[PDB]
Design a protein around this ligand. Structure first.
Ligand SMILES: COC(=O)c1cc(C[C@H](NC(C)=O)C(=O)N[C@H]2CCCCN(Cc3ccc(-c4ccccc4)cc3)C2=O)ccc1C(F)(C(=O)O)C(=O)O
Length: 106
């Protein structure tokens, strides 16, 4: 039950998730999952990043969910649940700006 996972912020906006992520105390990979503002049934993985080029910044990755059942960022790499997706991405950067590290403070 996703509503329960501590990294699931549910119904919060894009701007708010960015206000939470852009804290100077956040190390690369700080993250939360929320509802997509415009695609029903889609979610967004908001992730903090940091480089000398841009400094502290946020990326937003859409997570699709099929009725066949899979959750994914790229259809090539799918998961049976949001949790497993999160777990995978905490060990693999792959196409993400950085691997999932720590849950975003509130
Ligand atoms: C303007 O925005 C939107 O409409 C909107 C848009 C996005 C996508 C996001 N758009 C914005 C304006 O935030 C974006 O472009 N992120 C990039 C982030 C950087 C990577 C590049 N890329 C393409 C891509 C390439 C590779 C991979 C990848 C990842 C892991 C492994 C393999 C490949 C993922 C994506 C993305 O999707 C997500 C949520 C909402 C949205 F629903 C909304 O309603 O705004 C929201 O904020 O809620």
């Amino acid at each position: 039950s996703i509503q329960a996972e501590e990294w699931y912020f549910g119904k919060i906006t894009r701007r708010e998730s960015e206000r939470l992520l852009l804290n100077a105390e956040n190390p690369r990979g700080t993250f939360l999952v929320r509802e997509s503002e415009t695609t029903k049934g889609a979610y967004c993985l908001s992730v903090s990043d940091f480089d000398n080029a841009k400094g502290l910044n946020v990326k937003h990755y859409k997570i699709r969910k099929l009725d066949s059942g899979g959750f994914y960022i790229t259809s090539r790499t799918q998961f049976n649940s949001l949790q497993q997706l999160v777990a995978y991405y905490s060990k693999h950067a792959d196409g993400l700006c950085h691997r999932l590290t720590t849950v975003c403070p509130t």
